[PDB]
Amino acid sequence: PHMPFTLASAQAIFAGVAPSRIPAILAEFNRLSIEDRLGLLWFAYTETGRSITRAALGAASMSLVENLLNEIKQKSRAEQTQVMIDIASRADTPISRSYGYFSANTKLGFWYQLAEWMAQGLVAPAPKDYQLSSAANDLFNTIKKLDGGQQIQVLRDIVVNMGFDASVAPAPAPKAEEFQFERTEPVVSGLKVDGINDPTPLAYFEAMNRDDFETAVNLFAEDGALQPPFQKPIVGREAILKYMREEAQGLNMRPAQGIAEVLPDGSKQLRVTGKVQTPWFGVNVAMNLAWRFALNPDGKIFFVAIDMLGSPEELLNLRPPSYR
Ligand SMILES: CC1=C(/C=C/C(C)=C/C=C/C(C)=C/C=C/C=C(C)/C=C/C=C(C)/C=C/C2=C(C)C(=O)CCC2(C)C)C(C)(C)CCC1
Numbered sequence: 307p308h309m310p311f312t313l314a315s316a317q318a319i320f321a322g323v324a325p326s327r328i329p330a331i332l333a334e335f336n337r338l339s340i341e342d343r344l345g346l347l348w349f350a351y352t353e354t355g356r357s358i359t360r361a362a363l364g365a366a367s368m369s370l371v372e373n374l375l376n377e378i379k380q381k382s383r384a385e386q387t388q389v390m391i392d393i394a395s396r397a398d399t400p401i402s403r404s405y406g407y408f409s410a411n412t413k414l415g416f417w418y419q420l421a422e423w424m425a426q427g428l429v430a431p432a433p434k435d436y437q438l439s440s441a442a443n444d445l446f447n448t449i450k451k452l453d454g455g456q457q458i459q460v461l462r463d464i465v466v467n468m469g470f471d472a473s474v475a476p477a478p479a480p481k482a483e484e485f486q487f488e489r490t491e492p493v494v495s496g497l498k499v500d501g502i503n504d505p506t507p508l509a510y511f512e513a514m515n516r517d518d519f520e521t522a523v524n525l526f527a528e529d530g531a532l533q534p535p536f537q538k539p540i541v542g543r544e545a546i547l548k549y550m551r552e553e554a555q556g557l558n559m560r561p562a563q564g565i566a567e568v569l570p571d572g573s574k575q576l577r578v579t580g581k582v583q584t585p586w587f588g589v590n591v592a593m594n595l596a597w598r599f600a601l602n603p604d605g606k607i608f609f610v611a612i613d614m615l616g617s618p619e620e621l622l623n624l625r626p627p628s629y630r
Pocket of ligand 1: 344347348351358414417418419420421424433455458459461462465514533534535553554557559582584586593595597612
């Protein structure tokens with residue numbers, strides 16, 4: 307009584323989340339000292355900071371970054387050093403709580419602008435000067451082996467999980483942290499995805515590529531879910547649309563091959579792969595992704611998982627029975 311999908315059985319399609327070195331890297335990072343973490347972030351960012359899109363965030367998000375960074379700027383070098391520690395360790399402090407309330411791209415923008423100020427000498431370069439442990443230097447080496455997309459996904463996971471959240475069920479973020487980006491490249495040309503004819507996943511890509519989230523969210527079942535890489539599923543159309551507006555806007559998605567299986571009741575499981583650009587890096591970083599779709603018999607998306615991949619070989623279709 308495989309059908310219909312539940313969230314669990316949907317999560318399990320095509321052997322579940324694509325295998326990755328990222329979880330072990332994040333777990334190892336989280337066991338380091340706070341100084342080792344900040345120092346490693348300085349070096350990790352020194353690889354990738356050149357290719358970051360300058361001036362990416364919109365006005366309202368930039369105002370939040372700049373207000374908080376102002377409060378930081380007029381602290382002493384010692385207090386500034388301590389504030390980076392408080393945020394990075396998710397300490398209960400006013401500034402760490404303020405950071406905790408930021409949507410994800412506002413958090414990334416905060417550190418971007420801080421890193422610029424650290425270069426103007428407007429803020430203490432304490433991360434630059436931290437003495438890394440062997441464990442930290444070993445982890446650095448491991449990270450440098452990841453592909454470009456994997457490296458920025460590690461940075462992102464680390465940055466967005468910083469700050470203190472005082473509430474177990476916080477409010478949705480302000481409507482001004484929505485639609486943060488303005489596109490630079492033309493919308494991706496009408497997709498041919500070798501192996502995928504089903505109109506649902508093709509409409510999904512078409513809508514997301516032109517920021518048409520009203521279309522995209524209406525492709526979901528009422529109780530449908532969207533699972534971002536190494537994140538919990540976002541469930542129902544209200545939550546999914548809010549998330550799409552906050553975090554899935556301005557992406558260029560180039561799925562190019564995939565496969566389907568039809569279940570006896572007409573449900574369908576699909577796994578599509580290809581390359582995606584984030585407005586944070588533009589054409590500079592092509593992330594290798596897989597989308598795993600579970601469709602109900604009416605063609606609605608019950609579930610879509612987005613898995614971060616690491617290699618060209620992971621783009622190919624998986625091989626039953628184990629889906630390797
Ligand atoms: C901290 C720190 C520092 C500064 C760090 C800085 C400055 C880091 C900046 C990092 C940035 C900017 C990273 C951005 C990463 C963005 C990524 C990896 C985006 C991936 C997006 C994906 C994969 C989306 C795919 C999706 C698809 C395809 C769907 O179909 C549905 C939606 C969605 C799931 C969204 C300094 C140096 C001061 C030292 C002290 C500590």
